Enzyme design. Structure first.
Site, PDB file in Angstrom:
ATOM      1  CB  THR C   1      -0.954   0.037   1.213  1.00  0.00           C
ATOM      2  OG1 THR C   1      -1.803   1.189   1.124  1.00  0.00           O
ATOM      3  CG2 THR C   1      -0.188   0.067   2.526  1.00  0.00           C
ATOM      4  CB  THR C   2       1.371   4.073  -1.911  1.00  0.00           C
ATOM      5  OG1 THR C   2       2.161   3.034  -2.493  1.00  0.00           O
ATOM      6  CG2 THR C   2       2.219   5.334  -1.834  1.00  0.00           C
TER       7      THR C   2
END
EC number: 3.4.25.1
Lengths: 222, 80, 202, 239, 239, 213, 215, 240, 204
Positions: C1-2
């Site tokens: 995830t970012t």
């Protein structure tokens, strides 16, 4: 295990296989993996079977109390939150992957609950060993605002794909349709495979088996 | 006689605890203080259930030879 | 995830990808990691989904009770402090990285970063999750003081697109939110809308 | 006698006189509150009396917000009222946490009332000498009005009053519902204010009363400003 | 009658007085007198001990809590011993944790809290003992008194116990000179002050006097029967 | 992963006498190959008649010194007398055995004057077994120091050599010499020696330089 | 913190005549990543004391909150007493040793620096609870690199002025920036004096890269 | 009538008389007043000197419950010191959890609820203290709150507690505190205390004052002695 | 596995207005038989039986605990337990120890108290109930006996045919495993009677 669910235009359709495997032997056929939580909320289960059964039963009872007290039908979000909080407290040691589906005053809601307490609201979900094949079918053919028959066909196709491709799954297919108006729980909706005819009869005649001792105790029918 | 037996037991165990911990013999004043602390507990400042609510209805005379020589100590229900 | 947040004057822009994974299988490709803790306080969630969801709901509960009993809009620093206390006390058993961003009248737009281990830092821009590694350079070069709201939105979109293409765990659609005194404007960028960058193309 | 002076013991007629004394404790305050329901709105009004000029008028209030879409008015001991308000806020937030949706007004009233029951059954603590009236909008049922009392009775109402002039006020309201035509928002507020002013004989000014409302259009509980209250008051006098 | 309102600490009286606490404050009057006074460089405690009989030794009226703090008791020896144990453990905890001598003001604050808890709750009685606490710290010499009521004071000088008003008036009329006194002058002043409390027939002796001194260079020391003779010899006679 | 101990080094020595006791130690604190500090004496004055020396994990040395000081105060308050050296020894044995299962990593030596007026030294293993000894060396350089003390002070393996009671001067000379040798051939011990001698007068502290590394 | 997560390195301190100075880089590293670059790893405990930390920043923040509330409550009771740097050092030693004994270690190693009663104080506290006082202190890789220089100048000159002490800590910070990967260019300097505590803002080291061209 | 014996009980006419009896406790106390103006809040206490022996700066009725708030008490000093410990604990917990200085309204509410706990239960008596709390923060502004033994809490532009409450209240009423500034308000507080003090019944008093406001940068503190002496001289002059 | 330590085999089968439940008799410690008379089928009613295979100790323990619960149930409610209710009770008992499980694989076989409709089910280690209309099996030799049942079983069997089928299946199955055998006992439950027979089997 393959369990899957989709949201159609006016409700939900839930589907699951009917095979229980202990190790690599089919311990059971015609097993029921679609459970009752409430009149408007049913839930499929996968993972550890005892964990799925007991957690679904416990949440069913708690929602029965909640609905009795509040005097209105239970909401799906309440079931989701109860489930996820219990699962999070147990830190995945209770092993259950659940497809939660019900209709309520807000509308149709489908939730997917993982063993560690994660939840995801989606249009379509799959869980179990056959989740990947069922999701392949769903990713291919799902469209928004499907009709009930179309959704039933899609879920049947997905559970069938899980049945044939995955070893752990395979038996009759079950469907459950929850709408605002009605519920139709469909134990076997389809019977994709059947056992073949036994060509040779091996029925043992009386006296085939020796007996060292015998004791007949009469029962007092009354 | 009964609460006397209780205080005598406290005195004996405290003497032996002192021997265990410091390898020496208690003074008569220290032993009398040890039992007196138990006698004080009728006030119920402690939360322990096993302390008699009533004061100890006994007076003791503690007589012993210590580093200071022969000593005689008196103890009363108050714990003084 | 970012997950990525950036502070513009008078508010914040939050951004996150939609991909959550179990191993190499994308269990949900449309996840929403930007959650409302309050009307003007959001958290970007990275790390274990169960841990982040639990802590987010708990902080929402506590901050709502605090806000109603104080009869005042809650402070972003207060929300971040609650997040810190939870994550630090349970740092051994918890795997979460949170970016707490929002708007409060006292201190304007604020961005706070709670990495794993339970520490709180205020940052002009914050990036977190697995994919933030790949875009540290892009944010360091690209960031300029006093960007506008639309400029910050484009900046967040470009950074998240770069991290998404270069990270397998990251992917999906870009979910973007802009929180200010006026209110929250949430948008999703999908397909062609997502910024795209050229390939080497020998 | 001695059958009073402890909540647990029953009278020879089985009446539990202590809770009945707690009911008197509400009237000891000398303030009245009225709540009336409407087709699309619910309102709560109560007297606001500042004994001293030095008191900050903003701080003194009997109207509290249990949650964004529920409001209450407390009548009785100020301290017990504030404590019950805090317990109500905790119950509402805990309901939201556990069940994922805003607590219904009826369930909030039920929770607070059964707590009052555990008070009136256990020995050492005393019933809180206060009365609560909750107003909110439920999507299924429309507006709602409910009241908790020290005993644990939590019945819902079309309209109600609490305090010293409760009997006069409910006599007034009973006549108005009997000649039922409707209640829009303005008529609802006017009915509440006329009930309170008539039973007290006060002929209020805007400072003397505090009003709070909920409406299906704007579900959030809001406490109207002195200007809005004066706007309603002047409309009453003009007609 | 008003025999009611006196039974327990938890019952307020119709005029806002908790009579059990006052009855506990009467306890300090029962004990033998004590006097404490300070100079710029020293703090002193002096006591009148009592004996059950000629054969019996005189009771211990001055107790050392720490090098920098010591106490003298008037009232119940049981409560005195308990509170002294608590104070000693607090000082030991401060030295273990922070490696500093505990401030005497903070110690009396702790005593006040511990003493206050009985008065408000049903159960344990108020500590029916009055203590004079004297110590030297970085701020300087200090003398405090603690009542059976948890309230405590800071004093230039003070006397507690039976017939202590005579010592208090002597101390007040002679107070101005105390601040610049030598330790010998100061202990002599305190000895005369407690001599005021004694019966006219009785006189100060080596046996019935105990003296407690602490200062910048002097840790708390109790000068016993033999050791008080240097300080006592200076005193002239009864007036 | 987390190791609750580290060997902070140092050595301690104690040698009794007919009318005196000596307790001596290095003043170096060393974690691993680095020197934390060059002035950290391991000897602590418990009473006028007693000194304790501790070597091993410094955190355990510190907490044990604080505990012993506090319990000394408590004994003084309760019994209206100072703890004797034997009493401190037994109390220390019990304290060390209290944590049998998560032990104090310290080697302790108690040196003092007994009630009779003679010198006494009590030597402790990390888990609190204790024995009265005429002399003993503790810590990193126990192996190096104790044999020479056994030869010179105990006259062991020496034939046709008269036995003389040890004197204060000879004892201090011997202590300085043995610590010099341990400074030479033990990496942990060096950079100073604090000699704490206890007599009927009281503790007297002398410091002598040892070679910096 | 069984596992450190975000850590800072090398707080240095040396005591000069009339005070003490401590300096620290402003970087908290997420395991070989310069994740946080403006964090302050030095705190003002009270007017007479400073504290700085190396190791897990979260543990530092927790200790900040606890110790700050302690300082505040003594200020509230307001009897004119205050905590000495020795007192803060002792309490910190106790706390770290207790958390070690519980096998829930606070990973940080801290420098307590203060000037009170005309006497300077500079003391070390480790995650295991090892504690001591010394003229100069260096944590982390500072112990291996900077402490030799400090010890050389201090051994030849036992007493140092504030100016030369400041130049010394700057030089040691330059060395650590050269030869420690976890270090950062920007660092703070803070000095306790008779006047009080003042922490200077981001300060930077001039660096000599002359040997690069020598190759 | 056994109704007044306990606080769990109710009178047949709906009155909990133990609480009123506890409210009568504070009236035994010497007066204390707190006035709120634009810049900040000023507190004042008439600390009667019972004996010459007692040290000055002792029996303090003005406490600092946090850096930004101060507390002035009337009623039982033991209960007041305990309540101050409770308030300090509440403020410290608020800082530790929510990360900033406690709002005064919230602090008053929490300590008031703690007080109100005691009126309910039979085992434990109501507190015998009524106290005022005051703070200044640039966000919240000047705030003055008073808590009775019941647990009722309200915000007062001016407030008085203790024996001479009513007279002090009329004197405060004729003041116009809202426009005024703190350095004048200290003088007027001294005037009011000197007025309400009864020389015949009370032998002597030492005026004990404190304030919080912008002039302190939002820290409650005891008045500098020069300002105390100026205010006291002004009060003696005005008394005539 | 720990289940293989003692070894066992239990089977149940459903005919027409009848049930059969059969189990081996060996008790042995990993390889050494101790006794050929172990009770692995216990009566839980007039025409309801439970069969436990797994660890011998947990077999006896869950049997005793279930009889405790069942006797209190029968006394309190004044009726015989229905088979499904016994299944649910056993599942609750096993799931109570979901961590640190009783090492058993119970089998319930009986007739309804009133309808006399036959009921067979099995439960896992941690109380997962499975109800079947043909047969249920548990023990070390589940694989062999599953195949043998799948072949031999036929619907709507007579009592005599059911006995023949269950006997053949148990004997041929326990012949092909090491740790179970040493005889087999077959209980046949009909509405009017209980018939218990011990078959002749290889003692190897």
């Amino acid at each position: 295990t393959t369990i899957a669910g989709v949201v159609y235009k006016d409700g939900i359709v839930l589907g699951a296989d009917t095979r229980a495997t202990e190790g690599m032997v089919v311990a059971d056929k015609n097993c029921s993996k679609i459970h009752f939580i409430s009149p408007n909320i049913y839930c499929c289960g996968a993972g550890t079977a005892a964990d799925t059964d007991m957690t679904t039963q416990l949440i069913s009872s708690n929602l029965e109390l909640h609905s009795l007290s509040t005097g209105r039908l239970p909401r799906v979000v309440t079931a989701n939150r109860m489930l996820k909080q219990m699962l999070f407290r147990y830190q995945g040691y209770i092993g259950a992957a659940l497809v939660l589906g019900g209709v309520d005053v807000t509308g149709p809601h489908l939730y997917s609950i993982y063993p560690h307490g994660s939840t995801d609201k989606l249009p379509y979900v799959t869980m179990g060993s056959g989740s990947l094949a069922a999701m392949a079918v769903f990713e291919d053919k799902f469209r928004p605002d499907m009709e009930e028959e179309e959704a039933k066909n899609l879920v049947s196709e997905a559970i069938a794909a899980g049945i044939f491709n995955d070893l752990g799954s395979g038996s009759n297919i079950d469907l459950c349709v929850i709408s605002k108006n009605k519920l139709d729980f469909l134990r076997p909706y389809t019977v994709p495979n059947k056992k073949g005819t036994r060509l040779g009869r091996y029925r043992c005649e009386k006296g085939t088996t020796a007996v060292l001792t015998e004791k007949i105790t009469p029962l007092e029918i009354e | 006689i009964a609460d006397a037996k209780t205080l005598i037991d406290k005195a004996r165990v405290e003497t032996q605890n002192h021997w265990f911990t410091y390898n020496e013999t208690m003074t008569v004043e220290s032993v009398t203080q040890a039992v007196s602390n138990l006698a004080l507990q009728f006030g119920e400042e402690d939360a322990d259930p096993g302390a008699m609510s009533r004061p100890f209805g006994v007076a003791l005379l503690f007589g012993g030879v210590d580093e200071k020589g022969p000593q005689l100590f008196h103890m009363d229900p108050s714990g003084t | 995830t970012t997950i990525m947040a950036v502070q513009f004057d008078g508010g914040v822009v939050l951004g996150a990808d939609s991909r959550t994974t179990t191993g190499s299988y994308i269990a949900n490709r449309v996840t929403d990691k930007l959650t409302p803790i309050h009307d003007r306080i959001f958290c970007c969630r990275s790390g274990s989904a169960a841990d982040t969801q639990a802590v987010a709901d708990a902080v929402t509960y506590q901050l709502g009770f605090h806000s109603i009993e104080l009869n005042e809009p809650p402070l972003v620093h207060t929300a971040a402090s609650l997040f810190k206390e939870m994550c630090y006390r349970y740092r051994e058993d918890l795997m979460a990285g949170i970016i707490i961003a929002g708007w409060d009248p006292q201190e304007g737009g604020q961005v706070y970063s709670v990495p794993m281990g339970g520490m709180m830092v205020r940052q002009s821009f914050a990036i977190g999750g697995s994919g933030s590694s790949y875009i540290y350079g892009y944010v360091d070069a690209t960031y300029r003081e006093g960007m506008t709201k639309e400029e910050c939105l484009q900046f967040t979109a470009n950074a998240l697109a770069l991290a998404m293409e270069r990270d397998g765990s990251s992917g999906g659609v870009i979910r973007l939110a802009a929180i200010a005194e006026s209110g929250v404007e949430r948008q999703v960028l999908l397909g062609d809308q997502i910024p795209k960058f050229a390939v080497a193309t020998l | 006698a001695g059958f009073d002076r402890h909540i647990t013991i029953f009278s020879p007629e089985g009446r539990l006189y202590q809770v009945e004394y707690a009911f008197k404790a509400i009237n000891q305050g000398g303030l009245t509150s009225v709540a009336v329901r409407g087709k699309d709105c619910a309102v709560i009004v109560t007297q606001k009396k500042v004994p001293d000029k030095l008191l900050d008028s903003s701080t003194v209030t009997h109207l509290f917000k249990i949650t964004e879409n529920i409001g209450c008015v407390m009548t009785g001991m100020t301290a017990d009222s504030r404590s019950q308000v805090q317990r109500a806020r905790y119950e509402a937030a805990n309901w939201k946490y556990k069940y994922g949706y805003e607590i219904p007004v009826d369930m909030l009233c039920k929770r607070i009332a059964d707590i009052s029951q555990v008070y009136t059954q256990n020995a050492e603590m005393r019933p809180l000498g206060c009365c609560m009236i909750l107003i909110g909008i439920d999507e299924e049922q429309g507006p709602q009005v409910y009241k908790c009392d020290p005993a644990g009775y939590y019945c819902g109402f079309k309209a109600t009053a609490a305090g010293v002039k409760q009997t006069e006020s409910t006599s007034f309201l009973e006549k108005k519902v009997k000649k039922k035509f409707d209640w829009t928002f303005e008529q609802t507020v006017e009915t509440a204010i006329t009930c309170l002013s008539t039973v007290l004989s006060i002929d209020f000014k805007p400072s003397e009363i505090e009003v709070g409302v909920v409406t299906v259009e704007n579900p959030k509980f809001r406490i109207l400003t002195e200007a809005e209250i004066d706007a309603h008051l002047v409309a009453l006098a003009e007609r | 009658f008003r025999n009611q309102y006196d039974n327990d600490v938890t019952v307020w009286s119709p005029q806002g007085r908790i009579h059990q606490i006052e009855y506990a404050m009467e306890a300090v009057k029962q004990g033998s007198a004590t006097v404490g006074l300070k100079s710029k460089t020293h703090a002193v405690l002096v006591a009148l001990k009592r004996a059950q009989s000629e054969l019996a030794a005189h009771q211990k009226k001055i107790l050392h809590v720490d090098n920098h703090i010591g106490i003298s008791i008037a009232g119940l020896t049981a409560d005195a011993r308990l509170l002294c144990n608590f104070m000693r453990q607090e000082c030991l905890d401060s030295r273990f944790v922070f490696d500093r001598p505990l401030p005497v003001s903070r110690l009396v604050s702790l005593i006040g809290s511990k003493t206050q808890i009985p008065t408000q709750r049903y159960g344990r009685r108020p500590y029916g003992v009055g203590l004079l606490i004297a110590g030297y710290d970085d701020m300087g010499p200090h003398i405090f008194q603690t009542c059976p009521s948890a309230n405590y004071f800071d004093c230039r000088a003070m006397s507690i116990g039976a017939r202590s008003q005579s010592a208090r008036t002597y101390l007040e009329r002679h107070m101005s000179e105390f601040m610049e006194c030598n330790l010998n002058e100061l202990v002599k002043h305190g000895l005369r002050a407690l001599r005021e409390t004694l019966p006219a027939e009785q006189d100060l002796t080596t046996k019935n006097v105990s003296i407690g001194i602490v200062g910048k260079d002097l840790e708390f020391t109790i000068y016993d029967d033999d050791d008080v003779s240097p300080f006592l010899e200076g005193l002239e006679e009864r007036p | 992963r987390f190791s609750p101990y580290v060997f902070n080094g140092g050595t301690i020595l104690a040698i009794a006498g007919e009318d005196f006791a000596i307790v001596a130690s290095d003043t170096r604190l060393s974690e691993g190959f680095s020197i934390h500090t060059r002035d950290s004496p391991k000897c602590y004055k418990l009473t006028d008649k007693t000194v304790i020396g501790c070597s091993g994990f410094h955190g355990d040395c510190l907490t044990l010194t604080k505990i012993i000081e506090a319990r000394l105060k408590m004994y003084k308050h309760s019994n209206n007398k100072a703890m004797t050296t034997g009493a401190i020894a037994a109390m220390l044995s019990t304290i060390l055995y209290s944590r049998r299962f998560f032990p104090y990593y310290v080697y302790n030596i108690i040196g003092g004057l007994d009630e009779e007026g003679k010198g006494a030294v009590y030597s402790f293993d990390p888990v609190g077994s204790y024995q009265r000894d005429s002399f003993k060396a503790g810590g990193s350089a126990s192996a190096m120091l104790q044999p020479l003390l056994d030869n010179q002070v105990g006259f062991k393996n020496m034939q046709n050599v008269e036995h003389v009671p040890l004197s204060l001067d000879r004892a201090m000379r011997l202590v300085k010499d043995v610590f010099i040798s341990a400074a030479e051939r033990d990496v942990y011990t060096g950079d100073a020696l604090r000699i704490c001698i206890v007599t009927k007068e009281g503790i007297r502290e002398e410091t002598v330089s040892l070679r910096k590394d | 913190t069984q596992n450190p997560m975000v850590t800072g390195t090398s707080v240095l301190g040396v005591k000069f005549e009339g005070g003490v100075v401590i300096a620290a880089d402003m970087l908290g590293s997420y395991g070989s990543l310069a994740r946080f670059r403006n964090i302050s790893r030095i705190m003002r405990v009270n007017n007479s004391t400073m504290l700085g930390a190396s190791g897990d920043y979260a543990d530092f923040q927790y200790l900040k909150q606890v110790l700050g509330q302690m300082v505040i409550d003594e200020e509230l009771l307001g009897d004119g007493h205050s905590y000495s740097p020795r007192a803060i050092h002792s309490w910190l030693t106790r706390a770290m040793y207790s958390r070690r004994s519980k096998m829930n270690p606070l990973w940080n190693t801290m420098v307590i620096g203060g000037y009170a009663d005309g006497e300077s104080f500079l003391g070390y506290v480790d995650m295991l609870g090892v504690a001591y006082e010394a003229p100069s202190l260096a944590t982390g890789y500072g112990a291996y690199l900077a402490q030799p220089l400090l010890r050389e100048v201090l051994e030849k000159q036992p007493v140092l002025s504030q100016t030369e002490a400041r130049d010394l800590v700057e030089r040691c910070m330059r060395v650590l920036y050269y030869r420690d990967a976890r270090s950062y260019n920007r660092f703070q300097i803070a000095t306790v004096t008779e006047k009080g505590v003042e922490i200077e803002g981001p300060l930077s080291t001039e660096t000599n890269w002359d040997i690069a061209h020598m190759i | 009538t056994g109704y007044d014996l306990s606080a769990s009980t109710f009178s047949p006419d709906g009155r909990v008389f133990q609480v009123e009896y506890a409210m009568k406790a504070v009236e035994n106390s010497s007066t204390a007043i707190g006035i709120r103006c634009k810049d900040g809040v000023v507190f004042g206490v008439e600390k009667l000197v019972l004996s010459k022996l007692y040290e000055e700066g002792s029996n303090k009725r003005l406490f600092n419950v946090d850096r930004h708030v101060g507390m002035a008490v009337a009623g039982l000093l033991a209960d007041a010191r305990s309540l101050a410990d409770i308030a300090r604990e509440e403020a410290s917990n608020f800082r530790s959890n929510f990360g900033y200085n406690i709002p005064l309204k919230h602090l008053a509410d929490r300590v008031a609820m703690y007080v109100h706990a005691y009126t309910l239960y039979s085992a434990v008596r109501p507190f015998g203290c009524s106290f005022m709390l005051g703070s200044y923060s640039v966000n919240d502004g000047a705030q003055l709150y008073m808590i009775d033994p019941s647990g009722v809490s309200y915000g007062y532009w001016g407030c008085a507690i203790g024996k001479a409450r009513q007279a002090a209240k009329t004197e405060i009423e004729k003041l116009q505190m809202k426009e005024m500034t703190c350095r004048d308000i200290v003088k007027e507080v001294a005037k009011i205390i000197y007025i309400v003090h009864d020389e015949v019944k009370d032998k002597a008093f030492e005026l004990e004052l404190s304030w919080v406001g912008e002039l302190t940068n939002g820290r409650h503190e005891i008045v500098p002695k020069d300002i105390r002496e100026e205010a006291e001289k002004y009060a003696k002059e005005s008394l005539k | 596995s720990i289940m293989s330590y003692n070894g066992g085999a239990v089977m149940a089968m459903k005919g027409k207005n009848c049930v059969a439940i059969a189990a081996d008799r060996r008790f042995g410690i990993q390889a050494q038989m101790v006794t050929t008379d172990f009770q692995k089928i216990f009566p839980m009613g007039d025409r309801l039986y439970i069969g436990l295979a797994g660890l011998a100790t947990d077999v006896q323990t869950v049997a005793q605990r279930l009889k405790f619960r069942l006797n209190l149930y029968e006394l309190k409610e004044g009726r015989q337990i229905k088979p499904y209710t016994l299944m649910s009770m056993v599942a609750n008992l096993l799931y109570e120890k979901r961590f640190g499980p009783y090492y058993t694989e119970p089998v319930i076989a009986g007739l309804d108290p009133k309808t006399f409709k036959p009921f067979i089910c099995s439960l896992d280690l941690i109380g997962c109930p499975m109800v079947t209309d043909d047969f249920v099996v548990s023990g070390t030799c589940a694989e062999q006996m599953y195949g043998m049942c799948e072949s031999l079983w036929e619907p709507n069997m007579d009592p005599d045919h059911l006995f023949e089928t269950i006997s053949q299946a148990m004997l041929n199955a326990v012949d092909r495993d090491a740790v179970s055998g040493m005889g087999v006992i077959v209980h046949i439950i009909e509405k009017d009677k209980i018939t218990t027979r011990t078959l002749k089997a290889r003692m190897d």
